[PDB]
Write a protein that binds this ligand. Structure first.
Ligand SMILES: O=P(O)(O)O[C@H]1O[C@H](CO)[C@@H](O)[C@H](O)[C@H]1O
Ligand SMILES: O=P(O)(O)O[C@H]1O[C@H](CO)[C@@H](O)[C@H](O)[C@H]1O
Ligand SMILES: O=P(O)(O)O[C@H]1O[C@H](CO)[C@@H](O)[C@H](O)[C@H]1O
Ligand SMILES: O=P(O)(O)O[C@H]1O[C@H](CO)[C@@H](O)[C@H](O)[C@H]1O
Lengths: 282, 280, 281, 255
């Protein structure tokens, strides 16, 4: 009757990313690069830093690239070796065998259904959920900051962020309680409220740490927000504000902004990129 | 007590070099015995045995095994546009999440492959099926084995008497008491030298193992693991009520295709007719 | 002046619905007869016939067909690491460029498929091979055909006598003069109705056509119906294969082909024959 | 006269090691410049220049390039089910047969790559486009080049290391960094076959008109990360729906 550690994270990667066509008509959206790494790469790096040791990808149909990316690139590594090029550039692209599991979603039925797909791999253990479109820039990574708070309050946690009024109908909204620094009690939550019925402004961001009871609730109704809801009254539920900036690579403008931000932070790229940005701006 | 099954591991990361050039760019596990691939048969067998979580330990060029168990979108659409029943595909798709894939990364054998499923299995007994061992019969091999499991528990493996000159190719069992279909395993040696075989009953690619076996594998990180397990838990060999075809070998693959074909009402007539002629 | 033969078209975009579930996610052209995929036998055949440009018109889920004819990097490296000879793969890789692929995009049949190779063929004669028609024998179907082509020229197709209740499934030929292995085609109808068959010699998946046939296909923007318009002005003969053909298009044929080849293999025949008789009563 | 020009060769078999780990399992030719992958821009450029036959010489892990130019069955179905227009995909797929693929098999460089298309091109003039060289401008590099072709014929290359002679405005008889845009005569194929590299186009200077064309626009070397980012920023600033937010961010982020 103990409580297990969270050595697990679930990555919903079965979307058709229709917003980025034509680029995504044959390329997984999750594979779009922020400078030189694909969105999922950042996401799993984040998880590793947070101490997670079992990544479980719930995929779709045309996404083999996601699978190959985290395996040995046999010919590539051979080619590089034949050129004295170091494989350090691939550090972190491959985990221990078994640490990355895949399960097909089969039918595109949303986030809750997706998480539900991992039910048997998670078991009676708390688990994390990361939506790669939410590029979280900062140190430590969002998940690590979150796990840090988990270690002290336990229960369920989600990344929270103040959003403009005309933006509230696009996210799940939190009904805030007591604030204790970075944490803030969630007294309620509604998935995309109507534009006049927003309980507040702090929305839910694609970073979660949930207790196994949430899986159970999903199996039973067998969606997510409504499932976390059912667990306000009996388990610690807090919103965590990220010490860094988040870029919504879900929309083209964010994607570009993220690329720029990261490039400006790179020793070898900022000089050239800065110089160019400057002129190009008038 | 005897913890219930429901989890099966399928090692499918081999390069099947024996079937080249057929397996040069296609998974050996996908070779058809008439009209269904070897894994399909193995999965069906698991389903019948009450297993509800398939764990595939794959290799690099094997996306076909993945697509085979998902919805074939365009195909199903084209069949519907021709009033063709999709019943032909029943059993091809399981519930979302019931089939998990993990990459073996490096081909280091059976033990290593099974080891790759450690976190998915957990504490929990698990089954292991090698699709190359085509098990023809009813009920299926795994079902017959699980029936014996719910009675004796512990670890079980499929056993089969093999000719003398063939013993050096299998793991051999040192038999104890026989109770109908079961036979106690008092010891086992992987591929003994010819003249050194303790007996003739070898190990076949069908296993039901206790979680302590995974533990022993993580620790040594193969056949040698099952054995640090004889004085502690009931360990029996099960004889299959049916015939097994070694599709690991060219001749076996063909024999299997012939056998199944002859059991098919719509194929038997034509096949038998030809077989006879062609034989002289 | 007979245009030399140097190109072959392989229609490999079918969904092989007949072999489900085996063909649910695997190209039917990759089904093996003992050792080698159907398409491998087909290209072998073309190579023997002196063809040096294979042109595959494929579909959507058929990357295996493309990988099969390229270097299998990891595999060849692993075999080398085990002193295993790569001879087993001889013929699986041709010279760079000798195999071209074009996507059919939509499954509109054989004529459409061949039409897709129009700009690759151009103004030159071309062959057409349907891998489902496993041609067992030697020299080998295309070779035997090209031998006849080199003396008669024009257009040729493999012809085979088929049972009466089987005629409605093939294109049927109206035979003329027979000159040994050849037989003039005076006409042909695609799948005639049962009772309407002009004869019994059907068209088999092996063709040698003149560029004018492409022209006619481009204009009509089907196959059978186009070869027709080429009767009164280009030598058109049907060729009989010196060997046996297996219709791997249907399950029984696939099985039969596998058994036939197996029995011709010194290393497999003993075990296979022994089994065959026992399991047969 | 001058044999028109209806064929283009696209060398797309590189391992893009410079963009690791992004290109570990994804073709570098598929890297997006905001909305579309590099090859898309390249083929669009070709179509605008009147090219009717695209020939891709690919490598091993590059199925994405093939699927991209075919019908995305399930996707188009899903969009339809959402009343979303497919115009977003216009230019994504050409007439069947207009895109041919040949495997390079062995990574032996540009010359060998072009050589692989020898039998598809035949005795005809052909273009060559390296998608890493993102050519931003209107009417687009190949078009501008083809315009000069119909006048002078022979062989042309995009210029921006070469020594010149006479400058006829945009043309200049052969700095001038050579750029990945070529229009070559069939005799160059023959010379490649024989020695069986590119600087063998030179064995073609005393017999055919050979000029360098200067591009009316700017080129971004998406071969290196700085260039890739610059290209994405430039295009974004040119898009009415993205420029506002992108510019506002850029400014703030720059200090
Ligand atoms: O992004 P989705 O899938 O449209 O919506 C999901 O993630 C959002 C954050 O990105 C949350 O605010 C929503 O509550 C959640 O349902
Ligand atoms: O097939 P392998 O790898 O030579 O040997 C493996 O499968 C055999 C059955 O096929 C088992 O009897 C062996 O114990 C196992 O190690
Ligand atoms: O096989 P298909 O495409 O159904 O039909 C095609 O090949 C047959 C032989 O296999 C010929 O008899 C038909 O005339 C030809 O159109
Ligand atoms: O990559 P290569 O073949 O060494 O060089 C090639 O690509 C370069 C861009 O990457 C171009 O600037 C060169 O003109 C072209 O020949």
């Amino acid at each position: 009757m103990t409580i297990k550690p969270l050595r697990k994270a679930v990555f919903p990667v079965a979307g058709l990313g229709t917003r980025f066509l034509p680029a995504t008509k044959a390329m997984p959206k999750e594979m779009l690069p922020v400078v030189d790494r694909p969105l999922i790469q950042y996401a799993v790096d984040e998880a590793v830093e947070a101490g997670i040791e079992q990544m479980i990808f719930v995929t779709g149909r045309g996404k083999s690239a996601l699978e190959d990316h985290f395996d040995i690139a046999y010919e590539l590594e051979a080619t590089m070796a034949a050129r004295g090029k170091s494989l350090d550039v691939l550090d972190g692209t491959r985990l221990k065998p078994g640490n990355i599991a895949y399960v097909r979603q089969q039918e595109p039925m949303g986030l809750g259904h997706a998480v539900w797909c991992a039910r048997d791999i998670v078991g009676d253990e708390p688990f994390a959920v990361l939506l790669p479109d939410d590029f979280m820039f900062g140190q430590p990574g969002c998940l690590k900051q979150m796990v840090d708070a988990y270690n002290k309050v336990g229960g369920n946690l989600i990344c929270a962020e103040e959003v403009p009024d005309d933006q509230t109908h696009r996210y799940g909204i939190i009904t805030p309680g007591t604030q204790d620094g970075v944490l803030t009690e969630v007294k309620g939550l509604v998935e995309k409220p109507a534009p006049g019925t927003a309980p507040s402004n702090l929305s839910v961001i694609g970073r979660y740490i949930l207790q196994p009871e949430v899986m159970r609730i999903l199996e039973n109704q067998g969606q997510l927000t409504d499932a976390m809801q059912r667990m306000i009254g009996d388990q610690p539920f807090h919103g965590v504000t990220f010490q860094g900036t988040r870029y919504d690579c879900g929309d083209k403008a964010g994607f570009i902004q993220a690329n720029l931000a990261v490039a400006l932070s790179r020793p070898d790229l900022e000089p050239a990129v800065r110089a160019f940005a400057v002129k190009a701006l008038g």
